[PDB]
Design a protein around this ligand. Structure first.
Ligand SMILES: CCCCCCCCCCCCCCCCCC(=O)OC[C@H](COP(=O)([O-])OCC(O)COP(=O)([O-])OC[C@@H](COC(=O)CCCCCCCCCCCCCCCCC)OC(=O)CCCCCCCCCCCCCCCCC)OC(=O)CCCCCCCCCCCCCCCCC
Ligand SMILES: CCCCCCCCCCCCCCCCCC(=O)OC[C@H](COP(=O)([O-])OC[C@H](O)COP(=O)([O-])OC[C@H](COC(=O)CCCCCCCCCCCCCCCCC)OC(=O)CCCCCCCCCCCCCCCCC)OC(=O)CCCCCCCCCCCCCCCCC
Ligand SMILES: CCCCCCCCCCCCCCCCCC(=O)OC[C@H](COP(=O)([O-])OCC[N+](C)(C)C)OC(=O)CCCCCCCCCCCCCCCCC
Ligand SMILES: CCCCCCCCCCCCCCCCCC(=O)OC[C@H](COP(=O)([O-])OCC[N+](C)(C)C)OC(=O)CCCCCCCCCCCCCCCCC
Ligand SMILES: CCCCCCCCCCCCCCCCCC(=O)OC[C@H](COP(=O)([O-])OCC[N+](C)(C)C)OC(=O)CCCCCCCCCCCCCCCCC
Ligand SMILES: CCCCCCCCCCCCCCCCCC(=O)OC[C@H](COP(=O)(O)OCCN)OC(=O)CCCCCCCCCCCCCCCCC
Ligand SMILES: CCCCCCCCCCCCCCCCCC(=O)OC[C@H](COP(=O)(O)OCCN)OC(=O)CCCCCCCCCCCCCCCCC
Ligand SMILES: CCCCCCCCCCCCCCCCCC(=O)OC[C@H](COP(=O)(O)OCCN)OC(=O)CCCCCCCCCCCCCCCCC
Ligand SMILES: CCCCCCCCCCCCCCCCCC(=O)OC[C@H](COP(=O)(O)OCCN)OC(=O)CCCCCCCCCCCCCCCCC
Ligand SMILES: CCCCCCCCCCCCCCCCCC(=O)OC[C@H](COP(=O)(O)OCCN)OC(=O)CCCCCCCCCCCCCCCCC
Ligand SMILES: CCCCCCCCCCC1=C(C)C(=O)C(OC)=C(OC)C1=O
Lengths: 312, 48, 98, 169, 80, 347, 171, 110
């Protein structure tokens, strides 16, 4: 019965990632005064199926790999970490209810840069390796403000339990006491997933992969995008939870996470790219000083207000 | 809002902890009889 | 004593002899050194969680942090070596024989 | 089999160190130390140290071995008998240890070691509404004042030292 | 102190907001009247068991029952 | 280097050694050694040449290996004792590992193999710190763990350090390697009297630090790093030849000088314990150290080697170097033997 | 060493309180108010004797006083109690805050038919006092006699005889 | 146990998808491709700045590792000491950032 629950987690993740590509092409279409795909399916609904069948029968690109083993392991690690970031997510009950789900997610997202690094070294191109080092340095840079913003917000939660974070937000959304942490969190998770305006992998690392494994990297990246929007929804926009009707919470956080994923799609059709030093300047000289200052404020603030949340 | 609600959550935590404290003598007595039961069983099987 | 301590100590000695018998690279040496630190983390952690000595639970974190900072120092040393010879080979570090 | 699981993880742990102590290449060495950190984290998780195991992921693997693989990928330009011989040597030493301690329920390499599963040494009580490990780590700020002072000073000096010795001036 | 502050708020407002939020975080718990209540709530949270005392004969302020009047009270926590 | 950063880094070196000296917990001992190494690394790389970077790499590898063996000894102590007091060790395996770790930190033979390298690679001031201040913290831990130090181990390390540091300096023309092999021999002398009377260990440590600081301060005053460059001193600064004469005659243990004081007292505490062979062999092996000290005095003070023409220019510039405590250390390292019973202040 | 002495299985037989944890937590505050005295006798015995074998009979009194707590619920207020512990039982963390009207019905029915008052916030965590007739353990740790300490230093401090006596130094 | 089953299921699904991606289009009998980059064959130039941002990450991540027990540390009874040491750790992280600033460490990746 638990295996059925794992399947009903991981298969709808793949389906929502498959149709997020259609929603991206449609929403970027209408924001660009054109349409997105509407020929291949009725209202374009068969475009990801056609595209997946297209990619899985395209010729393998057949690279000369430096290491065969890491060339195999980087999609494996990317997909495995893309799927295991969902199991502590409370919606309203997680698959794996654990005491440290927040720290688990921060750990399994910290492990995600090895896929980029192994895919960059396993290609024989030095240019792909330079791009992989830039992407790894970018991601590990913004993980710093992920960790500190996340700690500062969980000082109002009392624990690293993600299910406690719904109980925390039953009177107010947590964006109202923590909107500067929310906006720096939102831009930092936008910079985690190599997403525009932080997509320097498309601006002039896994270009030596064939269409199959490049599609697997692509779907792991969109699983991370949907997951970080769901995690931002649970973290700052906590919905009402009636324990006798859990589908109220499920419909509500689904609507909020869809709006937040569309907000990623709406950012990428609005801004030009940063130069690499410009988002390094954005992290180390703008986001991190305010993040440390708000970390001091959210340490000292439940003590000066007598609003220290419960441990349990 | 977080001030009012975390104060209410602390009072609810103290209520749950005093429910636990009111239950701890009975659970301690049952735990003592549990471990003495298991040690007597291990003792008799060691003797045989 | 307990059987898992055997394997954690033997892992420490394996990474010791790896750190005490270089092949060519300084990076492989630092990998063996941090394997030694990892085995110390696991062993101190299993002791402190075993005996329920509560205050020492902050001990391995400290044992992480300092030593991880130590690793950073070694990596920078390696980079200065690699800013002289082009490799991190330990056989290039023999200017001090005379 | 399942009552020995930490032991089994620990065997993988020893195998993982022979994955890089033989030193095949520093990138395969990095991969072996990553797998070793994962299984040793699992060992930490199975005594109840969840926070310490997630420090092994977040700080040791996701923090530091990232930097090892990063620095290594900026060297060793991309394209043994002693490596495979030392690897099978360490593997056969470890499985001889396994076979001895499983056929005798007692072994002595340097210390005496029991051969039963390490589930036996545990405690039979509860810790209430706290993890003792979590509260001992929370004690770093109230009881651990001098430790926080010297650790933060060493990290500040570490930043200063890294900036001094990498400048070249 | 006046032109310098407007100058740094014109050039580098992120740093001014940083040092302002950090300065409030430093000074404001020493000036807040609710800082004492944080202490009083954290010491009133019963993680352990209140192990009772042997009544030797002279303890006038220790109760015999939890609902007795003497002892520590938390009416300040209910009311606030 | 920025002088503020230099002051903060030297205070962090001193802070790590003080944290080793004043702490009662083993984790704080390990933290003091980590802080001390982490802060002394830029003092070695002060002049930024590949010899300093190589020396810092070798120093990092040896001290990191010693710190890992130290933490393993501490962890085995927590196994077999359940506690963390900096006192005797409750396992001979942890005692052996901690004695090995501290021998690696001191550079005692056969872990001596980093001391003549690193001291050659680094400047004279950083070598002064390495050979005087960096001997304080492991000798403090050896002072506090001596009820559990194995006798044959510490005496093997001691005689092996004395013999190897004696035969090291006979082949040496570089002054920093001469001071390094002198360091290995004198650390053997310090740890040999350790389990018998650690007050004489402290006396030997203080007199050795005074004499080594005198010799490095003379080397920095004359800007000489080789024997043949030290031989130019009589034509430039004739008083400095007299100072290196009396200090090197002191370091060989020649009476009536103060460097005779420790080793004699060491013999004075080893014939009480019915060890007669061992201080005799140690005293006879110290004649090797005295032989290359005599070689340096022949090259510098007792003869006049030929100088060059450009020395005539340096006659017109007096020494603008801050020769800190050089008269004080020169007097204390030579004329202190009539104050031999002052050693009771170290009890 | 010696043989450990365990009680027989007849000494451990008692009518077990076979109710679930939600039944315990729903009835918790009235159990802590009404079954105060033998519970605190037992826990004082348990922290003073430091040995459960010396604390069995008092524990039986606990297991005697708990059941009379529940029968007296079952004789008068079984239906509001059942409605209350069912709603407590539904929750995963067993929240009191989800179940306030059932608690109100149960407390109203207990206060009417049995006169029991629920403890206020802060009362069941008070450190109370217990009047016992059992003696205080003079050696609860079974500790033996400590070793006698080393003799102190005392008396006036005279100077050293003939100075330091170091080979020839007359002072 | 449920978590180990979940991790094994996710790894097995990922390995199955990777095997299908690496072996289903291999059955295409298309053609043998004869003679299968901005830099031609030059060595990779070492960038000091990439290593600097990686070590700065590592050190600030260690300071984060010190900061991680704070939601549990706010529950203490010694709150003045706890608040002082928490503000001191975040202040030492800020002093590390300010020293990284003013000695030109955050340059060309600012
Ligand atoms: C007790 C422990 C003492 C530890 C040593 C402390 C001092 C040395 C360490 C710091 C250092 O280098 O200081 C410079 C150092 C001078 O050493 P230098 O660099 O070689 O200078 C040579 C000439 O001074 C160069 O002349 P100048 O023109 O540059 O300046 C003239 C200067 C002018 O001096 C001043 O202006 C100093 C007065 C102001 C000080 C600050 C006040 C605020 O005169 C002197 O300093 C005369 C020398 C004084 C003696 C130095 C040694 C002191 C005793 C060390 C221990 C001896 C133990 C013997 C035991 C034997 C038996 C075992 O000391 C001083 O300047 C101050 C000396 C104060 C002595 C007080 C003794 C009792 C203390 C209680
Ligand atoms: C009314 C209110 C006022 C009352 C005032 C009362 C006093 C009035 C007179 C004022 C002056 C008093 C002077 C101190 C008292 C007498 C001390 C004395 O002679 O002890 C005899 C002492 C033992 O003889 P004694 O027959 O058993 O005792 C007679 C008294 O009862 C000795 O009495 P004690 O039993 O109490 O003596 C204790 C103990 C007695 O001694 C012992 O227990 C034996 C161990 C002594 C140390 C031996 C070390 C051996 C290895 C190192 C060798 C060092 C180098 C040798 C010389 C090289 C060139 C300088 O002494 C020591 O442990 C101190 C160490 C030695 C220093 C002696 C005092 C020197 C003051 C002047 C310093 C100037 C440089 C002097 C030479 C520096 C080297 C010593 O003689 C020796 O050890 C021979 C060595 C030379 C002694 C120094 C002579 C002092 C006068 C020197 C003037 C010429 C200077 C020329 C320019 C500078 C040099 C080129
Ligand atoms: C689940 C997500 C989507 C998964 C992938 C999509 C689902 C469908 C998968 C099977 C599609 C058909 C096989 C792959 C496509 C083959 C196309 C092709 O090039 O064919 C010519 C190839 C080769 O034909 P050929 O011999 O004429 O070679 C052409 C090349 N020359 C002439 C130059 C040498 O055909 C095959 O390889 C046939 C393989 C088996 C086809 C299916 C059999 C029945 C299976 C049920
Ligand atoms: C969770 C739901 C969503 C949350 C909100 C986010 C949605 C909006 C997204 C919009 C599209 C963003 C696209 C990417 C943009 C990236 C660039 C960017 O914005 O850079 C950030 C810019 C960077 O600066 P800059 O580059 O614009 O400015 C120039 C900077 N210098 C001079 C250094 C070159 O600003 C920040 O870093 C601000 C971060 C958030 C600030 C929060 C402050 C809160 C107020 C504190 C108190 C202030 C008063 C003083 C104290 C009073 C006390 C009582
Ligand atoms: C720089 C120093 C900044 C922190 C200063 C001390 C802050 C503090 O509250 O310390 C009390 C704390 C703890 O005191 P406390 O008030 O928590 O004591 C109550 C007792 N316990 C801990 C059991 C609850 O530290 C000390 O009292 C001693 C350690 C620090 C002493 C100062 C060291 C300065 C080093 C300079 C070099
Ligand atoms: C959780 C919910 C997830 C939902 C995911 C999917 C969303 C979209 C679902 C499908 C929507 C309708 C799709 C219709 C596609 C077009 C079908 C069509 O018209 O095909 C015509 C073609 C030729 O037929 P012919 O006989 O030649 O016609 C001449 C007429 N004189 O004949 C053919 O092509 C042959 C028939 C092909 C039929 C394919 C149907 C689509 C299958 C998509 C996969 C998903 C199925 C649904 C899953 C969820 C519901 C259980
Ligand atoms: C290169 C190799 C292949 C690469 C791809 C695959 C590997 C990488 C991706 C997978 C990473 C796996 C991470 C496994 C551990 C994660 C930490 C963890 O388990 O945390 C959750 C939880 C802590 O929460 P808590 O609530 O305290 O526990 C329940 C008790 N209340 O703890 C628990 O619930 C504990 C449950 C029991 C112990 C579980 C042990 C799992 C097995 C060992 C680790 C497996 C991974 C090894 C390799 C890692 C390589 C990075
Ligand atoms: C005696 C103490 C050690 C006991 C275990 C010995 C294991 C087998 C290895 C023996 C030495 C083999 C060898 O040739 O080592 C040299 C090699 C470095 O030399 P290199 O230049 O790389 O290769 C050319 C060979 N001269 O050196 C190495 O590669 C050594 C790697 C050591 C890693 C140890 C792995 C675990 C061994 C079992 C547990 C201890
Ligand atoms: C005491 C409170 C706690 C303080 C410590 C905690 C701080 C938390 C935030 C972390 C800050 C970390 C980074 C700090 C770096 C400071 C140095 C700096 O940035 O100087 C350079 C800057 C000018 O920028 P520039 O170099 O030109 O940059 C190139 C792009 N144009 O120069 C400037 O912009 C001038 C910066 C200095 C003056 C700032 C004044 C702010 C005053 C706010 C109101 C009062 C708040 C109370 C505290 C006052 C403390 C001074
Ligand atoms: C039980 C025992 C407990 C402990 C007892 C106390 C132990 C004391 C250990 C002393 C260790 C001294 C270490 C070296 C001094 C520290 C400061 C330093 O680095 O000084 C050197 C400094 C560097 O200047 P720099 O610019 O690098 O010069 C290069 C040339 N252009 O400046 C120079 O180069 C200037 C040249 C002269 C420097 C002379 C310094 C002498 C210091 C030692 C004095 C003697 C020790 C104290 C008295 C005895 C105590 C035992
Ligand atoms: C079998 C489950 C799905 C496997 C993955 C294939 C489908 C999803 C990725 C395909 C894809 C789409 C739709 C796509 O639109 C796109 O362009 C933006 C890609 O290239 C960057 C893609 O890779």
């Amino acid at each position: 019965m638990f295996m059925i629950n794992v399947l009903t987690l991981i298969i709808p993740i793949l389906l929502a990632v498959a149709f997020l590509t259609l929603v991206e092409r449609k929403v970027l279409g209408y924001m660009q005064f054109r349409k997105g795909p509407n020929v291949v399916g009725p209202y374009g609904l068969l475009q990801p199926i056609a595209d997946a069948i297209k990619l899985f029968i395209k010729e393998p690109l057949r690279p000369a790999t430096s290491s065969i083993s890491m060339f195999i392991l980087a999609p494996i690690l990317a997909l495995t970490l893309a799927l295991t970031m969902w199991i502590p997510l409370p919606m309203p009950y997680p698959l794996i209810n654990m005491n440290l789900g927040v720290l688990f997610m921060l750990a399994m997202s910290s492990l995600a840069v090895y896929s980029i690094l192994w895919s960059g070294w396993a290609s024989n191109s030095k240019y792909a390796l330079i791009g992989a080092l830039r992407a790894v340095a970018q991601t590990i840079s913004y993980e710093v403000t992920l960790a500190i913003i996340l700690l500062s917000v969980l000082l109002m939660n009392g624990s690293f339990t993600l299910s406690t974070l719904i109980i925390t937000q039953e009177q107010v959304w947590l964006i109202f006491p923590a909107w500067p942490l929310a906006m720096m969190w939102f831009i930092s998770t936008l910079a985690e997933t190599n997403r525009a305006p932080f997509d320097l992998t498309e601006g002039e690392f896994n270009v030596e992969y064939a269409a199959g494994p490049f599609a697997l990297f692509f779907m792991a990246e969109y699983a991370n995008i949907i997951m970080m929007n769901i995690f931002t929804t649970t973290l700052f926009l906590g919905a009402f939870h009636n324990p006798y009707m859990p589908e109220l919470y499920t419909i509500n956080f689904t609507i909020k996470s869809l709006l937040l994923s569309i907000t990623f799609l709406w950012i990428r059709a609005s801004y030009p790219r940063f130069r690499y030093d410009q988002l390094m300047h954005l992290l180390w000289k703008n986001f991190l000083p305010l993040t440390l200052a708000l970390c001091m404020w959210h340490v000292s603030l439940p003590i000066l207000l007598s609003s220290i949340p419960p441990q349990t | 809002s977080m001030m009012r609600w975390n104060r209410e959550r602390r009072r609810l935590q103290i209520e749950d902890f005093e429910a636990r404290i009111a239950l701890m003598p009975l659970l301690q007595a049952e735990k003592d009889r549990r471990v003495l039961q298991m040690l007597r069983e291990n003792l008799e099987e060691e003797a045989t | 004593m307990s059987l898992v301590y055997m394997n954690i100590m033997m892992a420490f000695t394996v990474s010791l002899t790896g750190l005490l018998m270089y092949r060519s690279h300084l990076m492989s040496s630092l990998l063996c050194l941090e394997g030694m630190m990892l085995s110390l983390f696991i062993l101190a952690t299993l002791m402190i969680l075993n005996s329920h000595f509560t205050l020492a639970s902050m001990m391995p974190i400290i044992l992480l942090v300092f030593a991880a900072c130590e690793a950073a120092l070694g990596l920078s040393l390696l980079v200065m070596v690699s800013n002289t010879y082009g490799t991190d080979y330990v056989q290039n570090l023999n200017l001090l024989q005379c | 089999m399942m009552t020995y699981i930490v032991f089994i993880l620990s065997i993988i742990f020893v195998m993982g160190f022979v994955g890089f102590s033989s030193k095949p290449s520093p990138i395969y060495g990095g991969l072996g130390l990553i797998v070793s950190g994962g299984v040793g984290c699992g060992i930490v998780l199975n005594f109840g140290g969840s926070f310490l195991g997630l420090m092994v992921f977040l700080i040791y693997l996701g923090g530091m071995m990232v930097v090892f693989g990063y620095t290594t990928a900026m060297a060793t330009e991309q394209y043994n008998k002693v490596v495979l011989g030392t690897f099978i040597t360490g593997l056969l030493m470890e499985f001889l240890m396994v076979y001895y301690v499983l056929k005798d329920k007692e072994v002595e390499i340097v210390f005496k070691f029991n051969g039963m599963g390490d589930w036996v040494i545990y405690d039979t009580g509860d810790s209430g509404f706290f993890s003792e490990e979590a509260m001992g780590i929370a004690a770093l700020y109230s009881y651990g004042t001098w430790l926080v002072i010297v650790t933060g000073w060493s990290l500040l000096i570490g930043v200063v030292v890294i900036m001094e010795i990498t400048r070249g001036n | 102190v006046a032109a310098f502050l407007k100058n740094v708020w014109a050039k580098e407002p992120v740093l001014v907001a940083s040092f302002a939020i950090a300065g409030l975080a430093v000074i404001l718990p020493t000036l807040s009247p609710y800082t004492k209540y944080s202490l009083m709530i954290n010491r009133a949270t019963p993680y352990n068991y209140p192990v009772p005392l042997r009544d030797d004969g002279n303890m006038p302020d220790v109760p015999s029952h939890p609902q007795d009047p003497q002892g520590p009270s938390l009416e300040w926590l209910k009311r606030l | 280097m920025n002088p503020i950063i230099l002051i903060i880094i030297l205070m962090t070196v001193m802070l790590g050694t003080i944290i080793v000296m004043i702490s009662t917990h083993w984790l704080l001992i390990w933290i003091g050694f980590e802080m001390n190494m982490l802060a002394i690394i830029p003092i070695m790389m002060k002049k930024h040449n590949p010899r300093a970077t190589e020396a810092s790499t070798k120093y990092f590898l040896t001290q990191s290996t010693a710190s890992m063996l130290l933490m393993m000894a501490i962890i085995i102590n927590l196994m077999f004792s359940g506690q963390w007091t900096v006192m005797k060790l409750f396992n001979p395996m942890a005692s052996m590992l901690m004695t090995m770790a501290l021998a690696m930190k001191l550079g005692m033979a056969p872990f001596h193999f980093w001391v003549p390298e690193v001291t050659q690679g680094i400047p004279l001031s950083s070598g002064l710190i390495l050979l005087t201040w960096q001997k304080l913290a492991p000798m403090s831990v050896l002072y506090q763990i001596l009820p559990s130090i194995n006798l044959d181990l510490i005496l093997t390390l001691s005689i092996l350090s004395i013999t190897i540091g004696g035969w090291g300096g006979l082949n040496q023309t570089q002054l920093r390697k001469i001071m390094a092999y002198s360091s290995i021999a004198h650390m053997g002398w310090m740890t040999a009297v350790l389990l018998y009377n650690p007050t004489m260990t402290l006396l030997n440590l203080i007199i050795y630090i005074i004499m080594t600081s005198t010799m490095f301060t003379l080397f920095m005053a004359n800007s000489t790093t080789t024997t043949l460059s030290l031989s130019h001193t009589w034509n430039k600064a004739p008083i400095m030849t007299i100072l290196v004469l009396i200090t090197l005659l002191s370091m060989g243990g020649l009476p009536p000088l103060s460097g005779f004081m420790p080793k004699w007292m060491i013999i004075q505490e080893m014939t009480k314990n019915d060890s007669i062979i061992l201080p005799t062999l140690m005293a006879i092996t110290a004649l090797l150290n005295l032989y290359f000290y005599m070689r340096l005095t022949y090259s510098t003070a007792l003869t006049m080697f030929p100088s060059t023409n450009n020395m005539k220019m340096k006659w017109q510039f007096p020494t603008t170097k801050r020769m800190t405590l050089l008269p004080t250390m020169t007097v204390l390292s030579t004329m202190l033997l009539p104050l031999t019973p002052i050693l009771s202040i170290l009890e | 060493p010696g043989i450990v002495e365990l009680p027989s299985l007849e000494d451990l037989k008692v009518q077990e309180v076979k109710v679930s944890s939600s039944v315990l937590k729903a009835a918790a505050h009235h159990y802590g108010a009404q079954c105060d005295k033998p519970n605190k006798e037992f826990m004082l015995c348990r922290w003073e004797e430091k040995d459960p074998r010396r604390c069995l009979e008092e524990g039986k009194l606990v297991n005697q006083c708990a059941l009379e707590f529940f029968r007296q619920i079952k004789r008068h207020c079984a239906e509001p109690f059942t409605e209350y512990w069912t709603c407590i039982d539904y929750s995963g963390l067993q929240l009191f805050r989800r179940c306030r009207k059932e608690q109100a019905q149960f407390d109203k029915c207990v206060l009417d038919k049995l006169g029991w008052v629920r403890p206020d916030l802060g009362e069941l965590s008070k450190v109370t006092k217990v009047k016992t007739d059992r003696p205080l353990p003079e050696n609860p740790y079974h500790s033996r006699a400590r070793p006698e300490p080393n003799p102190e230093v005392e008396g006036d401090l005279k100077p050293a005889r003939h100075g330091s006596r170091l080979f020839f130094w007359t002072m | 146990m449920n978590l180990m089953i979940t991790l094994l299921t996710n790894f097995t699904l990922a390995t199955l998808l990777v095997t299908i991606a690496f072996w289903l289009p291999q059955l295409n009998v298309y053609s043998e491709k004869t003679s299968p980059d901005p830099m031609g064959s030059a060595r990779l130039p070492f960038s000091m700045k990439f290593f600097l941002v990686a070590i700065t990450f590592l050190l600030f991540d260690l300071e984060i590792a010190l900061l991680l027990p704070l939601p549990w540390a706010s529950q203490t009874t010694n709150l003045n000491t706890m608040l002082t040491m928490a503000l001191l750790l975040i202040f030492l992280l800020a002093v590390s950032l300010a020293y990284e600033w003013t000695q030109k460490g955050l340059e060309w990746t600012e």
